[PDB]
Amino acid sequence: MHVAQPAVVLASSRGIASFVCEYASPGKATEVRVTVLRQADSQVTEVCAATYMMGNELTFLDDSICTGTSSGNQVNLTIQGLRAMDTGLYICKVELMYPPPYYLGIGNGTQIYVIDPEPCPDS
Amino acid sequence: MHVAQPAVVLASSRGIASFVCEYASPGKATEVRVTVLRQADSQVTEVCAATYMMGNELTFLDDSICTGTSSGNQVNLTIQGLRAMDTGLYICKVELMYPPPYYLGIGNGTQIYVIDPEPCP
Ligand SMILES: *[C@@H]1O[C@H](CO)[C@@H](O)[C@H](O)[C@H]1NC(C)=O
Ligand SMILES: *[C@@H]1O[C@H](CO)[C@@H](O)[C@H](O)[C@H]1NC(C)=O
16 A cells, blocks of 8 residues: 655754655545654664544544644644654554555655754843 | 765754865865855755865855865865755865866765754743
8 A cells, every 4th residue: 555755854943843644545444543663773663653533633642742633545743852863764654444454554754854953042 | 076075964953054075185285166056956056165275274255154164185164044945955066276187076965954943032
């Protein structure tokens, strides 16, 4: 299953990066699982993941780091609390969990560049 | 001549970006011209330029948004006043002007990413 996500995103001054992960639905999926994985160096790690009925909001483990909104064959993701060290490749994984059959799609990754604010005088 | 510059650089939250530009060591002390070209395909435009004798300090005198330092066959270019819309490809062009021969070197371009920061109250 084709998953597309932007090649590069810049985090804002507040360390919030947002991007669109959209999937090419092979059928009519009611339940979907989205996962954000961070790749680096040769390893992959799970950042956040929402399992949602398409017709409702997404709820994450922390949800202080990821938020998301579903809107058809796509989902608006937001990653928060980013610092420079978090610069890296963020992979969007999409799973269609219901109805059968299961489909799995993995996108090419979005490079997220993050900068730390410079010092600000007092106070 | 070979000119090396980093592939990607991030501007600070102050809208300042720096990168080193390195050229192939000339056979001798030479007058060197360093030029920053912004590439906005197919737009190519001079952002700033400076000339110095090797062994002297590089110093921009064009009143551009660029300042720089020099050491050996490297120059450290600092460009200030950048905003998000200035995100793009910045090419380091280096010319060995004289004593001859004349040599031209063009780097591969540094992609500079810039964000608009929050002010601080
Ligand atoms: C999701 O992204 C679309 C554009 O792809 C945007 O128009 C829409 O406002 C976004 N939904 C939100 C902000 O929840
Ligand atoms: C390049 O110049 C900037 C601004 O002066 C400085 O912060 C940085 O340390 C310099 N980098 C190198 C490699 O000299």
